[PDB]
């Protein structure tokens, strides 16, 4: 019922969920202390970020009381359909509870960018890991420059940027005279790719694609033998990054990462 002791089958009996949806939230503003206060009385830490475009997060506790949260969060009709990409851990990666109100779910600084007319442009890891292989797919990293540094797909270029807001400047200074050719865009977990395959989709450029749910989707599909990820993936807590296994690097990798989804 819950107020049992009862250990996990798993040693790494931390979960960790990963999420996002584009919906609009009207009442985006009051649905925060309702949240948070849900936060504080199960003992979830983690961020959710909340716009009138949607709602993004990552968040943290076992698995009862995930169950909790999870149907917590689902009981709002909008979010009945939010999808919980999990890891695993034997320590919570947040510090406390957080949820953010802010202008954009993931903040690329471009106005109107409506991630719906995505469809199309998604593949599964498994088109994914067939799709970069070919040398003249511009296979590009959406990542910031820690993350990609850290680790990334076999051949992807490095935007070099410090924030996803100068991703529209990358793209308007080396990708504009390349809209007839094959783009291929990845992130951790998806989030930023809705938004640049959206913009540049927009912006008239017709082969785009992104690899859906992101790295850490294709790391638990492709077995690690055959993967074409290099590297450590980073993430925005504590574990700093995640191997192939999706298992907190170890040793520890320091923490100046920096990390929550608000400065990325």
């Not at 793209?171 to 007839?180: A, E, G, P, S, T």
């Not at 989707?217 to 999706?246: H, M, T």
Request: charged share 30%.
């Amino acid at each position: 019922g819950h107020h049992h002791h009862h250990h996990s089958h798993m040693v790494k009996d931390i979960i960790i969920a990963s999420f996002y949806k584009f919906i609009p939230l009207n009442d985006f503003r009051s649905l925060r202390e309702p949240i948070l206060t849900k936060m504080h009385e199960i003992g979830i830490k983690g961020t959710i970020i909340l716009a009138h475009e949607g709602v993004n997060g990552g968040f943290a506790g076992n698995r009862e009381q995930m169950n909790v949260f999870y149907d917590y969060l689902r009981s709002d009709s909008r979010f009945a359909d939010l999808h919980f990409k999990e890891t695993y851990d034997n320590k919570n990666p947040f510090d406390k509870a957080k949820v953010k109100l802010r202008k954009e779910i993931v903040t690329m600084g471009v106005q109107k960018v409506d991630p719906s007319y995505n469809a199309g442009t998604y593949l599964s890891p498994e088109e994914w890991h067939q799709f970069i292989q070919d040398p003249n797919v511009i296979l590009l990293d959406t990542r910031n420059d820690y993350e990609y540094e850290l680790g990334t797909f076999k051949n992807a270029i490095n935007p070099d940027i410090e924030n996803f807001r100068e991703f529209p400047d990358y793209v308007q200074r080396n990708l504009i005279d390349k809209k007839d050719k094959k783009i291929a865009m990845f992130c951790t977990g998806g989030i930023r790719c809705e938004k640049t395959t959206a913009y540049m989709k927009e912006l008239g450029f017709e082969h785009v694609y992104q690899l859906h749910d992101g790295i850490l989707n294709y790391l638990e599909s492709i077995p690690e033998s055959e993967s074409l990820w290099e590297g450590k993936c980073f993430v925005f807590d504590d574990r700093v990054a995640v191997d192939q296994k999706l298992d907190r690097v170890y040793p520890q990798l320091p923490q100046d990462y920096k990390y929550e989804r608000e400065q990325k």
